[PDB]
Structure formats: C-alpha cells, structure tokens
Amino acid sequence: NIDQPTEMTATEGAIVQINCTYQTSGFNGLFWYQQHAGEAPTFLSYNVLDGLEEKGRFSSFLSRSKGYSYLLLKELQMKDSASYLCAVRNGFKTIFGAGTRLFVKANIQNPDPAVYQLRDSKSSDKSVCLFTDFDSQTNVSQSKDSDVYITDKCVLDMRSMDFKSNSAVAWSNKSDFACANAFN
Amino acid sequence: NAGVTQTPKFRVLKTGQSMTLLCAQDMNHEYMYWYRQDPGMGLRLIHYSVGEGTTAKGEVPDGYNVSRLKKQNFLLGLESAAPSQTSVYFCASSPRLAGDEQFFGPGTRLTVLEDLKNVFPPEVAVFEPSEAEISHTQKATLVCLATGFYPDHVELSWWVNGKEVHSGVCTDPQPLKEQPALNDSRYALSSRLRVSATFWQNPRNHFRCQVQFYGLSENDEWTQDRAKPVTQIVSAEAWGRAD
C-alpha cells in the first residue's frame, strides 16, 4: 500500500519534498509521475537502488529498508503546480498511490489587495466581485451564505509585463448583493 | 512520434447503454493498460494486456470487457453502463524490453446518468474591467462566467481579435456546485483575462470567452420541453472601450 499526502503548498523559488511510503512485499522499483489537471500523467523518475538521484530541478530519493521515497523539487516554479504520483512496480504492473496535489504560490512583488465590481457586458444588471492583487499568504474566506458563490484563488501571469496576480471571483443570483463583504 | 491516442474525449451515457473506449499506440509497445481515475483520487487498474492475443484483470475489473485484437489497439467495453462507472479512463502503453515507464493517453471522461434530463448546457457571460482597477493598477481584468452546466464536460478558452490567448488567463481548475446539497448539482466555472488598460481602452479590440460543452448526440432520445442539450459552443463577448 502506497501512502502520500493529499495536498501540499509551497511558494515559488522554494524547495518542496513530497514524501511517499510503500509496503515492501515484491519491490521491483519506485516511479514518480507528474500529472497536470486533467492531463495525461508523464514519467519523472525511476528508483530501484538507494538513495538520492538528480534530474534537473527534481531529485528522487529511495530508502529500500524504510519503504520510503521522496520527490524533491528545488527552484519551484508556477508550472510545477500538478499532482505527483508515487507508484510501485513488480516489470509489467505498476500500482499507483492516490497522488499529492501541489499548489505553487506566486511571490507577489508589490501587493495591493482590492475588491472590484465588474458589470455584465450584455444587461440584466448582473455583476461579479473580483478580489485581486493580494499576497499569497492571504486566505480567501469561503461563503457561509447559500446564494453567494466564491471561487478558489487563481494565479494569473501576464509574463510580457513579468507580473503575477492572485484573484478570486464572487457573485450572487440575488440583487442587491454586496461586493465589500464575501472575501473579508 | 505521436504516442498513445484515445477516443472519444467525452461521453454522456444513460444507465444501461453500451460503449466502447478505443486506444491506440504507434510505439510497437507490448504492454497496454486501462485505468480509471475519479476527480482526484488516483489511478486504478481495470485490465491490462501483455501482448496481442492475451488480456488480464487488474485491481478493479468488474464489470468491464477488454480486447487486444491487434498489438497497436486496446479496447475497453461497458455492456450495461452504471453511474458508478462515471470516471476519467486513461490508457497506457509500455515496452517489455528492458523496461520501464508507461506512456499515457489523453483520457476519456465518461458520465453515466439515470436520466438525461439533468443534462444542461452552460450560460456564458463576460464581465467588463472595473474602472477603479484600471485607474489604480493601469491593468484591466475581464471575468468570464460559465454557469448551470451538467455534467462537468467543458473547455473554456479566450479569443482576442479571432486568436486564442493563453497569456494573462487564469481559469478555475475545477468548477463549483451551484447547489452543494444535491448529487446532480449544475456547475459554475470562472476565468479571468487580464490585459493592460491601454489594450482594453482600444475599441478595435474584441474579447470573447468560449465554452465548448460536450453533451448529447443525435442517437440520444430527448423527451423534454426545452432545447436538446447537444454538444455545442456557448460564447459571450465584449469590445474594448475608452471609458
């Protein structure tokens, strides 16, 4: 049996270590796969011997006696946000762990959090609230109210301006809905 | 060269219906695999094949049929589709000699429902950048909202001046349930497109949010008083404005 954490979070530029434990029995190698949502998993590494192996910014560790493996990611990038799958072979059948979804937080150079109201392009006086430019340690308060929907934080990259921004969107099928509340 | 290919990409099935999932590989790989994977949630082996004539059971075989007629093809069969079979199906290929890694296909997302009456296309709305954001940041964020769709079989894209854009876009990785306390809740998905204030301030610029909905086919029976929720694109647009 393969045991991996469900979720992990790290900030861009840091080092992350994703731990995996497996139950010996028939050990013929440990695999690490990268799976972006909702794409095809792709091979990262294979480890049959102990201990640590570099493959660019990623290092794979194996300890056969402990039934332990870790995937180490240095110089963390936004593109590393994916699930990382720990898998065990015994050389035709590979059994996969449930995966660890890694969220990479952007390093916001000059934060200026603000809530803005955006108006519908067509009509019906429909509108959305946008909480943006907050730094990555900021927690987006989920709605306790049945009529208001609040999305998770989203990292946007302009790249041409070398600018990254976090946002969260909120709306209600009810009017008049307050923009200055929900996210606070 | 090309890798593992899979057909179809999406499918809505009524309970009891039959379906075949097709997988191909042009890598001359001896081993082929069929996995299912729920949202997130991991990879579970259904069946596998070591070569042409042979087929073998995995972790979760009941009740899927399988065939490896040719070395290049691997087929998965659903005799009488059940709602428990709603999943993403991944095909995989591996050589026998000497090893090692598995090459995966793009996946087939299948949704099996008791009633096709829960099938709804999204409504798409574009929200114009806040004048306060513009004057403050010299940046302009557009928001697109895809609402009321079911099942979660959508692809959202932004099109500027007839060209698809990726820079400055961020789409929710997963959609919200509009009614959380319901197992067949319709979905909501948001996306942000952020440009410079000067780009948005140009009335020659056209901003379009596109949502492709994979729904019903011609073969499927519709007995409701509302437009049949077939596979379609729903779009909302905005033009740039000086103020």
Side-chain angles (χ1 to χ4, degrees), chain A residues 87-137:
Chain A
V88 186
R89 207 187 52 185
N90 194 50
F92 41 90
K93 266 182 87 168
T94 302
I95 300 304
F96 292 74
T100 307
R101 182 167 75 213
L102 173 75
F103 187 95
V104 180
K105 291 178 282 182
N107 211 102
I108 309 306
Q109 297 291 57
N110 279 120
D112 59 338
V115 170
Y116 302 111
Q117 184 190 289
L118 283 65
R119 16 96 203 199
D120 186 356
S121 204
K122 59 139 225 295
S123 271
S124 176
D125 195 26
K126 293 265 162 181
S127 80
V128 295
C129 313
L130 171 79
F131 180 29
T132 187
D133 309 329
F134 52 91
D135 79 349
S136 308
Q137 311 103 73

Coordinates of all heavy atoms in Angstrom, one line a residue, chain A residues 87-137:
Chain A
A87 N 4.4 5.5 -7.4 CA 3.9 4.3 -8.0 C 5.0 3.2 -7.7 O 6.1 3.5 -7.6 CB 3.6 4.4 -9.5
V88 N 4.5 1.9 -7.5 CA 5.4 0.8 -7.2 C 5.2 -0.4 -8.2 O 4.0 -0.8 -8.4 CB 5.3 0.4 -5.7 CG1 6.3 -0.7 -5.4 CG2 5.5 1.6 -4.8
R89 N 6.3 -0.9 -8.7 CA 6.3 -2.0 -9.7 C 6.8 -3.3 -9.2 O 7.7 -3.4 -8.3 CB 7.2 -1.6 -10.9 CG 6.8 -2.3 -12.3 CD 7.7 -2.0 -13.4 NE 9.1 -2.2 -13.0 CZ 10.2 -2.0 -13.8 NH1 10.0 -1.5 -15.0 NH2 11.4 -2.3 -13.4
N90 N 6.3 -4.4 -9.8 CA 6.6 -5.9 -9.6 C 5.9 -6.7 -10.6 O 4.7 -6.4 -11.0 CB 6.3 -6.3 -8.2 CG 6.9 -7.7 -7.8 OD1 8.1 -7.9 -8.0 ND2 6.1 -8.5 -7.2
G91 N 8.2 -6.7 -13.9 CA 8.3 -5.4 -14.6 C 7.2 -5.2 -15.6 O 7.5 -4.9 -16.8
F92 N 5.9 -5.3 -15.2 CA 4.8 -5.2 -16.1 C 3.5 -4.6 -15.5 O 2.7 -4.1 -16.2 CB 4.4 -6.5 -16.8 CG 4.5 -7.7 -15.9 CD1 3.4 -8.2 -15.1 CD2 5.7 -8.4 -15.7 CE1 3.5 -9.2 -14.3 CE2 5.8 -9.5 -14.9 CZ 4.7 -9.9 -14.1
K93 N 3.4 -4.6 -14.1 CA 2.3 -4.0 -13.4 C 2.8 -2.9 -12.4 O 3.7 -3.2 -11.6 CB 1.5 -5.0 -12.7 CG 0.3 -5.6 -13.4 CD -0.5 -6.6 -12.6 CE -1.5 -6.0 -11.7 NZ -2.5 -7.0 -11.1
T94 N 2.3 -1.7 -12.6 CA 2.6 -0.6 -11.7 C 1.4 -0.2 -10.9 O 0.3 0.1 -11.5 CB 3.3 0.6 -12.6 OG1 4.4 0.0 -13.2 CG2 3.6 1.8 -11.8
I95 N 1.5 -0.2 -9.6 CA 0.3 0.2 -8.7 C 0.6 1.7 -8.3 O 1.7 1.9 -7.7 CB 0.1 -0.8 -7.6 CG1 -0.2 -2.2 -8.2 CG2 -1.0 -0.3 -6.6 CD1 -1.5 -2.4 -9.2
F96 N -0.4 2.6 -8.5 CA -0.2 4.0 -8.2 C -0.8 4.4 -6.9 O -1.9 3.9 -6.5 CB -0.8 4.9 -9.3 CG -0.1 4.9 -10.6 CD1 -0.2 3.8 -11.5 CD2 0.7 6.0 -11.0 CE1 0.5 3.8 -12.7 CE2 1.4 6.0 -12.3 CZ 1.3 4.8 -13.1
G97 N -0.2 5.3 -6.2 CA -0.7 5.9 -5.0 C -1.8 6.9 -5.4 O -1.9 7.3 -6.6
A98 N -2.5 7.4 -4.5 CA -3.6 8.4 -4.7 C -3.2 9.8 -5.3 O -4.0 10.5 -5.8 CB -4.5 8.5 -3.5
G99 N -1.9 10.1 -5.2 CA -1.3 11.3 -5.7 C -1.3 12.5 -4.6 O -2.1 12.5 -3.7
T100 N -0.4 13.4 -4.8 CA -0.3 14.6 -4.0 C -0.4 15.9 -4.9 O 0.4 16.1 -5.8 CB 1.1 14.7 -3.2 OG1 1.3 13.5 -2.5 CG2 1.2 16.0 -2.3
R101 N -1.5 16.6 -4.7 CA -1.7 17.8 -5.5 C -0.9 18.9 -4.9 O -1.1 19.3 -3.7 CB -3.2 18.2 -5.6 CG -3.5 19.4 -6.4 CD -5.0 19.6 -6.7 NE -5.8 20.0 -5.6 CZ -7.0 19.7 -5.3 NH1 -7.7 18.8 -6.1 NH2 -7.7 20.1 -4.3
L102 N 0.1 19.5 -5.6 CA 0.9 20.6 -5.1 C 0.4 21.9 -5.7 O 0.3 22.1 -6.9 CB 2.4 20.3 -5.5 CG 3.4 21.4 -5.3 CD1 3.7 21.5 -3.7 CD2 4.7 21.2 -6.1
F103 N 0.1 22.9 -4.7 CA -0.2 24.2 -5.2 C 1.0 25.1 -5.0 O 1.5 25.2 -3.8 CB -1.5 24.8 -4.5 CG -1.9 26.1 -5.0 CD1 -2.9 26.1 -6.0 CD2 -1.4 27.3 -4.6 CE1 -3.4 27.4 -6.5 CE2 -1.8 28.5 -5.1 CZ -2.8 28.6 -6.0
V104 N 1.5 25.7 -6.0 CA 2.7 26.6 -6.0 C 2.1 28.0 -5.9 O 1.3 28.4 -6.7 CB 3.6 26.5 -7.2 CG1 4.8 27.4 -7.1 CG2 4.1 25.0 -7.4
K105 N 2.5 28.7 -4.8 CA 2.1 30.1 -4.6 C 3.1 31.0 -5.3 O 4.3 30.8 -5.2 CB 2.0 30.4 -3.1 CG 0.9 29.6 -2.3 CD 1.0 29.9 -0.8 CE 2.0 29.2 0.0 NZ 2.0 29.5 1.4
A106 N 2.5 32.0 -5.9 CA 3.3 33.1 -6.6 C 3.9 34.0 -5.5 O 3.3 34.3 -4.5 CB 2.4 33.8 -7.5
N107 N 5.1 34.5 -5.9 CA 5.8 35.5 -5.0 C 5.4 36.9 -5.5 O 5.9 37.4 -6.5 CB 7.3 35.3 -4.9 CG 7.8 35.8 -3.6 OD1 8.1 35.0 -2.7 ND2 7.9 37.1 -3.4
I108 N 4.3 37.5 -4.9 CA 3.8 38.9 -5.3 C 4.7 40.0 -4.8 O 4.8 40.2 -3.6 CB 2.3 39.0 -4.8 CG1 1.4 37.8 -5.2 CG2 1.7 40.3 -5.2 CD1 1.4 37.4 -6.8
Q109 N 5.4 40.6 -5.8 CA 6.5 41.6 -5.6 C 6.0 42.9 -4.9 O 6.8 43.5 -4.2 CB 7.2 41.9 -6.9 CG 8.0 40.7 -7.5 CD 9.2 40.3 -6.7 OE1 9.1 40.0 -5.5 NE2 10.4 40.2 -7.3
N110 N 4.7 43.4 -5.2 CA 4.1 44.6 -4.6 C 2.6 44.4 -4.5 O 1.9 44.8 -5.3 CB 4.5 45.8 -5.5 CG 5.8 46.4 -5.2 OD1 6.7 46.5 -6.1 ND2 6.1 46.8 -3.9
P111 N 2.2 43.8 -3.3 CA 0.8 43.6 -3.2 C -0.1 44.8 -2.8 O 0.3 45.7 -2.0 CB 0.7 42.5 -2.1 CG 1.9 42.6 -1.3 CD 3.0 43.2 -2.2
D112 N -1.2 44.9 -3.5 CA -2.2 45.9 -3.2 C -3.6 45.3 -3.3 O -4.3 45.5 -4.4 CB -2.1 47.3 -4.0 CG -2.0 47.3 -5.5 OD1 -1.7 46.2 -6.1 OD2 -2.2 48.4 -6.1
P113 N -4.0 44.6 -2.3 CA -5.3 43.9 -2.3 C -6.5 44.9 -2.5 O -6.4 46.0 -2.0 CB -5.4 43.2 -1.0 CG -4.4 43.8 -0.1 CD -3.3 44.3 -1.0
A114 N -7.4 44.5 -3.3 CA -8.6 45.4 -3.6 C -9.7 44.5 -4.1 O -9.5 43.4 -4.6 CB -8.3 46.4 -4.6
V115 N -11.0 44.9 -3.8 CA -12.2 44.3 -4.3 C -12.8 45.2 -5.4 O -12.9 46.4 -5.1 CB -13.2 43.8 -3.2 CG1 -14.5 43.4 -3.9 CG2 -12.6 42.7 -2.4
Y116 N -13.1 44.7 -6.6 CA -13.7 45.5 -7.6 C -14.9 44.8 -8.1 O -15.1 43.6 -8.1 CB -12.7 45.6 -8.8 CG -11.3 46.2 -8.4 CD1 -10.2 45.5 -8.4 CD2 -11.2 47.6 -8.2 CE1 -8.9 46.1 -8.2 CE2 -10.0 48.2 -7.9 CZ -8.8 47.4 -7.9 OH -7.6 48.0 -7.6
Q117 N -15.9 45.7 -8.5 CA -17.2 45.2 -9.1 C -17.1 45.4 -10.6 O -16.8 46.5 -11.1 CB -18.4 45.8 -8.5 CG -19.7 45.2 -9.1 CD -20.9 46.0 -8.8 OE1 -21.4 46.0 -7.7 NE2 -21.6 46.6 -9.8
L118 N -17.3 44.3 -11.4 CA -17.3 44.3 -12.8 C -18.8 44.1 -13.2 O -19.5 43.3 -12.7 CB -16.5 43.0 -13.3 CG -15.0 43.1 -13.2 CD1 -14.4 43.3 -11.8 CD2 -14.4 41.9 -13.9
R119 N -19.2 44.9 -14.3 CA -20.6 44.9 -14.8 C -20.7 44.0 -16.0 O -19.8 43.9 -16.8 CB -21.0 46.3 -15.1 CG -19.8 47.3 -15.2 CD -19.3 47.5 -16.7 NE -17.9 48.0 -16.7 CZ -17.3 48.6 -17.7 NH1 -18.0 48.9 -18.8 NH2 -16.0 49.0 -17.7
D120 N -21.8 43.3 -16.1 CA -22.1 42.4 -17.3 C -22.0 43.2 -18.6 O -22.5 44.3 -18.6 CB -23.5 41.7 -17.1 CG -23.9 40.7 -18.2 OD1 -23.1 40.5 -19.1 OD2 -25.0 40.1 -18.0
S121 N -21.4 42.6 -19.6 CA -21.2 43.2 -20.9 C -22.5 43.3 -21.7 O -22.6 44.2 -22.5 CB -20.2 42.3 -21.7 OG -19.6 43.1 -22.7
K122 N -23.5 42.4 -21.4 CA -24.9 42.4 -22.1 C -26.0 43.2 -21.4 O -26.4 44.2 -22.0 CB -25.3 41.0 -22.6 CG -25.4 40.0 -21.5 CD -26.6 39.0 -21.6 CE -27.3 38.8 -20.3 NZ -26.5 38.1 -19.3
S123 N -26.5 42.8 -20.2 CA -27.5 43.5 -19.4 C -28.0 42.8 -18.1 O -27.1 42.1 -17.5 CB -28.7 43.9 -20.2 OG -28.6 45.2 -20.8
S124 N -29.3 42.9 -17.8 CA -30.0 42.3 -16.6 C -29.4 42.8 -15.2 O -29.9 42.4 -14.2 CB -30.0 40.8 -16.7 OG -30.6 40.2 -15.6
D125 N -28.5 43.8 -15.3 CA -27.8 44.4 -14.1 C -27.1 43.3 -13.3 O -27.2 43.3 -12.0 CB -28.7 45.3 -13.3 CG -27.9 46.2 -12.3 OD1 -26.7 46.5 -12.6 OD2 -28.5 46.7 -11.3
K126 N -26.5 42.3 -14.0 CA -25.8 41.1 -13.4 C -24.4 41.6 -13.2 O -23.9 42.4 -14.0 CB -25.9 39.9 -14.3 CG -27.3 39.3 -14.5 CD -27.6 38.1 -13.6 CE -29.0 37.8 -13.5 NZ -29.3 36.7 -12.5
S127 N -23.7 41.1 -12.1 CA -22.4 41.5 -11.8 C -21.6 40.6 -11.0 O -22.2 39.8 -10.2 CB -22.3 43.0 -11.3 OG -22.6 43.1 -9.9
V128 N -20.2 40.7 -11.0 CA -19.3 39.9 -10.3 C -18.4 40.8 -9.5 O -18.1 41.9 -9.9 CB -18.5 38.8 -11.1 CG1 -19.4 37.7 -11.7 CG2 -17.6 39.5 -12.2
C129 N -17.9 40.2 -8.4 CA -16.9 40.9 -7.5 C -15.6 40.2 -7.7 O -15.5 39.0 -7.7 CB -17.3 40.9 -6.0 SG -19.0 41.3 -5.7
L130 N -14.5 41.0 -7.9 CA -13.2 40.5 -8.1 C -12.3 40.9 -7.0 O -12.1 42.1 -6.8 CB -12.7 40.9 -9.5 CG -11.2 40.6 -9.8 CD1 -11.0 39.2 -10.2 CD2 -10.8 41.6 -10.9
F131 N -11.8 40.0 -6.2 CA -10.8 40.2 -5.1 C -9.4 39.9 -5.8 O -9.3 38.8 -6.3 CB -11.0 39.4 -3.8 CG -10.0 39.6 -2.7 CD1 -9.3 40.8 -2.6 CD2 -9.7 38.6 -1.8 CE1 -8.4 41.0 -1.6 CE2 -8.8 38.8 -0.8 CZ -8.1 40.0 -0.7
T132 N -8.5 40.9 -5.9 CA -7.3 40.7 -6.7 C -6.1 41.4 -6.0 O -6.3 42.2 -5.1 CB -7.5 41.1 -8.2 OG1 -6.3 40.8 -8.9 CG2 -7.8 42.6 -8.3
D133 N -4.9 41.1 -6.5 CA -3.6 41.7 -6.1 C -3.1 41.4 -4.7 O -2.1 42.0 -4.2 CB -3.5 43.1 -6.6 CG -3.8 43.2 -8.1 OD1 -3.5 42.2 -8.8 OD2 -4.4 44.2 -8.5
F134 N -3.9 40.6 -3.9 CA -3.5 40.2 -2.6 C -2.3 39.3 -2.6 O -2.0 38.6 -3.6 CB -4.7 39.4 -1.9 CG -5.3 38.3 -2.6 CD1 -4.8 37.0 -2.4 CD2 -6.4 38.4 -3.4 CE1 -5.5 35.9 -3.0 CE2 -7.0 37.3 -4.0 CZ -6.5 36.1 -3.8
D135 N -1.5 39.3 -1.5 CA -0.3 38.4 -1.5 C -0.8 37.0 -1.2 O -1.9 36.8 -0.6 CB 0.9 38.9 -0.7 CG 0.8 38.8 0.8 OD1 -0.2 38.5 1.4 OD2 1.9 39.1 1.5
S136 N 0.0 36.0 -1.5 CA -0.3 34.5 -1.4 C -0.5 33.9 -0.1 O -1.2 32.8 0.0 CB 0.7 33.8 -2.3 OG 0.8 34.3 -3.6
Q137 N -0.1 34.6 1.0 CA -0.4 34.1 2.4 C -1.8 34.4 2.8 O -2.3 33.8 3.7 CB 0.6 34.7 3.4 CG 2.1 34.6 3.1 CD 2.6 36.0 2.6 OE1 2.7 36.9 3.4 NE2 2.8 36.1 1.3

